Amino acid sequence: KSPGDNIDFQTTILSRFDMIFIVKDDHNEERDISIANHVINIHTGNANAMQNQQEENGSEISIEKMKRYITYCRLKCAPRLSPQAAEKLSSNFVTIRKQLLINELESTERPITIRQLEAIIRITESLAKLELSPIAQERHVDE
Amino acid sequence: TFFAPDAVFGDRVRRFQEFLDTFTSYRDSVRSIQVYNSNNAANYNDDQDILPHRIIISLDDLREFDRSFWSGILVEPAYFIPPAEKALTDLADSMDDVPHHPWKLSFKGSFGAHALSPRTLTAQHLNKLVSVEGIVTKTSLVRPKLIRSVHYAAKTGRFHYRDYTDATTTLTTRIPTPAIYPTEDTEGNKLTTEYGYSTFIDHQRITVQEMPEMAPAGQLPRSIDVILDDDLVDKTKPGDRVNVVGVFKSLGAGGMNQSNLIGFKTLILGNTVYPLHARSTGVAARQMLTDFDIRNINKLSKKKDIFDILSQSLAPSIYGHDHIKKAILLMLMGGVEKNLENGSHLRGDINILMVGDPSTAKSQLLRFVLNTASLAIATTGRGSSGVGLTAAVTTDRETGERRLEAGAMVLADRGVVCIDEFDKMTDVDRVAIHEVMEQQTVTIAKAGIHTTLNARCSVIAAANPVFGQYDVNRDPHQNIALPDSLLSRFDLLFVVTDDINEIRDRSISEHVLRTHRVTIPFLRKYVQYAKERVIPQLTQEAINVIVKNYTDLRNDDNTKKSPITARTLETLIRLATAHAKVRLSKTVNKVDAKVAANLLRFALL
Amino acid sequence: SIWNSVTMFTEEEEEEFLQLSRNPKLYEILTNSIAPSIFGNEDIKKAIVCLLMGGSKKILPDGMRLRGDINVLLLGDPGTAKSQLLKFVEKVSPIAVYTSGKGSSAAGLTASVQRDPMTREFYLEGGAMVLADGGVVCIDEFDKM
Ligand SMILES: Nc1ncnc2c1ncn2[C@@H]1O[C@H](COP(=O)(O)OP(=O)(O)O)[C@@H](O)[C@H]1O
Ligand SMILES: Nc1ncnc2c1ncn2[C@@H]1O[C@H](COP(=O)(O)OP(=O)(O)O)[C@@H](O)[C@H]1O
């Protein structure tokens, strides 16, 4: 079916929402054994929890710390985008508009709002606020 | 002689001389009051042949002037306020002494420690002068309070007198003496009381809740009552947001007195009681135009192109839509109001609707309507109950008297009501909105209190297209989804399309970008003076224009599109007059008529 | 301790934070913190991160203010672990309220005016949004509301 048209009679919901992720589960014995075995590991013998803990010794964050970190970054610094990144995103969005219009010449049933652009922006500032930097970068957006 | 003058008091008065003498701004202020009374005293006497007495005093001053007297008032109001009042009374008696009272102080501030909200209050702050803000509910019924008595006595003629000291008189405590109500004078003559000689002073007590927007995430609210007397009475209705400054008292005995849990009822005396503005509530424009501002307007009124600049001043963040912005101004102004002699009145204000695909900013535009609007309440879909209605609240509140609690559209009177998702709203309500919009009044027969009360509000509404994005291509009808008379009631139906183009897209992109990296302030000030000054009336320059136009519309458009009625004509006149207000012109003009023509055209085409 | 979460903290936390800001793999190691249990789904996995961190917030005149940060839809058939993942975000986020409804059970989903039976008057009854203000809200069955 058309990707939209799912929620009630109206896609407007999906329009308001910035990042929509359709998740799919297909059966692949390789991957299915991967996920399964992973869960068997999850229950007990807690081997996964252990793995998390040596991830904590070596690298990974305790998630009790992650919280405090998030609070930190959230209050301390408010990021701002760079001009070349801006024009980059202009090119981005006009290519989106043009190309996908051309796609919808056929009345292909599905979308594009400047709200989506604004989303992309907020992602860039979010991730900029990860690096904690007061300024954005191009690669940084390229992700 | 009372307790005879004491140099405690003596010093406290005398020291409060130099101030107010410096800063001298008050010394003449008092004079002014006198003046205003005198003139009006001359108005009652000669022509057919008043003001409150309290004068504001900034707390800012004392810090420079007297530290101890500052710290003293704040910390001990009881001891410093009444001598101050004494002083100012003496002065006021000096200013004009010849022709023939409390003369209270405001205490503005420059607060405070002592800035605190009714949630955080007592007992360190107890018996000190406090600034407490919040919703005012439930208010109370005003009652006159008896102070002096007068009596006639036959056969000996004469007259009499009596005085009454309440627990709340003065500030500081006093050894209470009940006076009874004197009757049966000795020697044993009867006493016929007389009224109108015996003075009264009004009395009111309003309770103040803590601010709901500044409220905690969730919890019960906790409020403290306040007593208000004479000049302070009735200033604020329930539902206003109010900053109350005044003494905080312990008054009464707490069970210690009668020997045989709860204790010491506490309440706030006076004092300032400012009504103030906060989004969706309680006026308040206000505004202060001083000397210079009004001059700026006056200069700016002559320039011929101003309307377009103004219309652009609304939208820092929003493209195009110059026509719609123009509209919102033309609602802010609104065609005066005209109430015929012994006949119904024609609707002054203009109502607007916006219909288009989402992302049209329709919901984004309205908040900016709200901010600079000077009022009014916002309402989104459902919404309700009663919307504008009093709901005729049962029961009591208090003692069993049936009273009304005003809904939005009533409370929003003389203002801009917003409606979001205007389509979603139940038809049951719409039925009432018919009565609100054109007719201009609300009618409640419910149980009950049976009254016709007035809501004359201006109205905006943003409403999604019927189904999906289909608005653009879809027919002139079946697209709106909310027949029928409503479509007419709205003076202007504006349609906006989200349909996409690459060029327009780029031009979106850059401004969006710069955004993340004619000033609004002067806008509303520009507006109020325009509103109460001055109504342009109507002129024979224009009429033939709007008549030509109107007849054109009916005759040609009834082939083109719909709906068109006399209503449209009314709207023509309102728009003309509004654009006249924008021009500040004491008259309606032909150019204006042409403008109204234009916007009503872009409405239609 | 939320709400009224204390924004102040000890020095060494700034120290070790500012030590974490120096990691090249910082982004990449964070994206590995969220779902120790949940396997794969890397786009979602990163999206959570960029969600929690808020975004550009602009008070610029006129009264219009743009917002942060965004929104995320996990929609899909079960075995997606999304309903578990939300419990996780709920744990991590400094102030968070998981409400799958319709609101539940007594809690309304949105700001609601209810009256104090004694004293009458009015107060905010509570709900997801209000109690959760200034942070993350987790919703399920979002079509069922
Ligand atoms: N003309 C415009 N210029 C810039 N941004 C706009 C414009 N119109 C809409 N937007 C964007 O659209 C969003 C507002 O959506 P809106 O149209 O109010 O939704 P709804 O259709 O529910 O009212 C905002 O993020 C705003 O940035
Ligand atoms: N990648 C995964 N890793 C671990 N557990 C998973 C994963 N995917 C699904 N699960 C399992 O799926 C369950 C979550 O179901 P969920 O998909 O949230 O149901 P629904 O989507 O109907 O809410 C959990 O019990 C969890 O054990």
What is the full DSSP assignment across B419-437?
A: EESTTTS-HHHHHHHHHHH
| Contact call for residues A77 and C56 (beta carbons, < 8 A) | no
Cβ atoms < 10 Å from Cβ of C8: 5
- Please confirm whether the linkage preceding B110 is cis (ω < 30° from 0): yes
Rounded Cα–Cα distance for residues B219 and C128 (Å): 14
Cβ atoms < 10 Å from Cβ of B270: 25
Rounded Cα–Cα distance for residues A118 and A125 (Å): 11
Q: How many CA atoms lie within 13 A of B408 on its CB side?
A: 22
Rounded Cα–Cα distance for residues B209 and B451 (Å): 29
Dihedral, C6, C8, C14, C18 alpha carbons, nearest 10: 70
What's the gap in Å between the CA of A31 and the closest CA on chain B? 39
What's the gap in Å between the CA of C10 and the closest CA on chain B? 27
> CA angle at residue B160 from B155 to B161, to 5 degrees?
170
Rounded Cα–Cα distance for residues B120 and B251 (Å): 20
| Contact call for residues A47 and A55 (beta carbons, < 8 A) | no
Q: What DSSP string runs through B92-125?
A: HHHHT-S------B-------TT---TTS--SSS
Rounded Cα–Cα distance for residues B121 and B113 (Å): 11
In Å, how far from its chain's centre is CA A10? 24
| Contact call for residues B318 and B365 (beta carbons, < 8 A) | yes
| Residue type present at position B584 | L
- Separation of first and last alpha carbons in chain B: 85
In Å, how far from its chain's centre is CA B18? 37
Query: How far apart are the CA of A119 and the centre of ligand 2, in A?
Result: 28
Rounded Cα–Cα distance for residues B451 and B406 (Å): 12
| Contact call for residues C51 and C96 (beta carbons, < 8 A) | no
Give the residue, out of C57, C58, C66, with the most ligand 1 atoms within 8 A of its beta carbon, to mutate for a pocket test. C66
Q: Residue B173 is encoded by which pair of tokens?
A: 């405590």
Rounded Cα–Cα distance for residues B371 and B515 (Å): 20
- Please confirm whether the linkage preceding A74 is cis (ω < 30° from 0): no
Q: Are strands B458-462 and B416-420 parallel, antiparallel or unpaired?
A: parallel
A58-67 long-range contacts, CB within 8 A, separation 24+:
A59/C25, A59/C29, A60/C29, A60/C32, A60/C33, A61/C20, A61/C29, A61/C30, A61/C33, A63/C33, A63/C91, A63/C92, A66/C30, A66/C33, A66/C92, A67/C92, A67/C93, A67/C94
Q: Reduce the DSSP state of residue C72 to 3 states and report it.
A: strand
Beta carbons of A123 and C50 less than 8 Å apart: yes
B546-555 long-range contacts, CB within 8 A, separation 24+:
B546/B572, B546/B573, B546/B576, B546/B593, B546/B596, B546/B597, B549/B593, B549/B597, B549/B600, B553/B600, B553/B604
| Residue type present at position B364 | Q
Please name the residue that has the structure tokens 């011929």.
B304
Q: Residue B516 is encoded by which pair of tokens?
A: 């993340």
Give me the residue from B359, B468, B509 closest to A94, CB to CB.
B509
| Contact call for residues A17 and B475 (beta carbons, < 8 A) | no
Q: Which chain A residues contact residue C142 at CB under 8 A?
A: 13
Q: Are strands B378-380 and B416-420 parallel, antiparallel or unpaired?
A: parallel
Q: Answer yes or no: is the C-beta of B424 below 6 A from any ligand 1 atom.
A: no
Q: Which residues pair with C66 in a beta bridge?
A: C58
Rounded Cα–Cα distance for residues A43 and A65 (Å): 24
Rounded Cα–Cα distance for residues B127 and B266 (Å): 10
Q: Which chain A residues contact residue C92 at CB under 8 A?
A: 63, 66-67, 70
Q: Residue C113 is encoded by which pair of tokens?
A: 């005016």
Q: What DSSP string runs through C29-56?
A: HHTTTS-SSS---HHHHHHHHHHHT---
Consecutive H or E run containing B73 = helix B67-75
Decide if A132 touches C, using CB distance below 8 A: yes
Consecutive H or E run containing B453 = strand B451-454
Q: Which residues pair with A23 in a beta bridge?
A: C76
| Contact call for residues B58 and B110 (beta carbons, < 8 A) | yes
Q: What are phi and psi of C59, to 5 degrees?
A: -95, 5
Rounded Cα–Cα distance for residues B70 and B73 (Å): 5
Beta carbons of A94 and B502 less than 8 Å apart: yes
Say whether B359 counts as a known binding-site residue: yes
In Å, how far from its chain's centre is CA A77? 21
> In B1-78, which ranges are E strands?
none
Rounded Cα–Cα distance for residues B369 and B381 (Å): 17
Helix locations, B234-321, DSSP H: 292-300, 306-313
Q: Answer yes or no: is the C-beta of B319 below 6 A from any ligand 1 atom.
A: yes
Specify whether the backbone of C116 is left (phi greater than 0), alpha (psi in -120 to 50) or beta: beta
Q: Exposed, middle or buried: residue B108 (CB in 10 Å: 0-12, 13-18, 19+)? A: middle
Q: Answer yes or no: is the C-beta of A40 below 6 A from any ligand 2 atom.
A: no
Q: What DSSP string runs through B218-257?
A: S-----EEEEEEGGGTT-S-TT-EEEEEEEEE--S--SSS
- Superfamily assignment of B5-114 in CATH? mini-chromosome maintenance (MCM) complex, chain A, domain 1 (3.30.1640.10)
Q: Give the burial string for B125-157 (b: 16+ CB within 10 Å, else e).
A: eebbbbbbbbbbbbbbeeeebeeebbbeeeeee
Q: Give the burial string for B44-59 (b: 16+ CB within 10 Å, else e).
A: eeeeeeeeebbbebeb
Give the residue, out of B312, B359, B380, with the most ligand 1 atoms within 8 A of its beta carbon, to mutate for a pocket test. B359
| Contact call for residues B241 and B135 (beta carbons, < 8 A) | yes
Rounded Cα–Cα distance for residues B435 and B529 (Å): 30
- Please confirm whether the linkage preceding B114 is cis (ω < 30° from 0): yes
Rounded Cα–Cα distance for residues A35 and C35 (Å): 13
Beta carbons of A118 and B512 less than 8 Å apart: yes
Sequence-separated (6 or more) residues with CB below 8 Å from residue B475? none
Q: Which residues pair with B243 in a beta bridge?
A: B133, B274
Query: How far apart are the CA of B76 and the centre of ligand 2, in A?
Result: 66
Q: Give the burial string for B417-449 (b: 16+ CB within 10 Å, else e).
A: bbbbbbbebeeebbebbeebbbebebebeeeee
Q: Reduce the DSSP state of residue B486 to 3 states and report it.
A: helix
In Å, how far from its chain's centre is CA B19? 34
Q: Which chain B residues contact residue A11 at CB under 8 A?
A: 468
Report which of B88, B76, B69, B72 is spatially closest to residue B26, judged by C-alpha positions.
B88
Q: Give the burial string for C89-128 (b: 16+ CB within 10 Å, else e).
A: beebbbbbbbbbbebeeebbbeebeeeeeebebbbbbbbb
Q: Answer yes or no: is the C-beta of C87 below 6 A from any ligand 2 atom.
A: no
In the DSSP assignment, the letter for residue C132 is T
| Contact call for residues C125 and C112 (beta carbons, < 8 A) | yes
| Residue type present at position B105 | L
Report which of C112, C102, C133, C130 is spatially closest to residue B383, judged by C-alpha positions.
C112
> CA angle at residue B92 from B88 to B95, to 5 degrees?
135
Q: How many residues does chain B have?
A: 605
Q: Exposed, middle or buried: residue B336 (CB in 10 Å: 0-12, 13-18, 19+)? A: buried
Rounded Cα–Cα distance for residues C98 and C1 (Å): 17
In the DSSP assignment, the letter for residue A114 is H
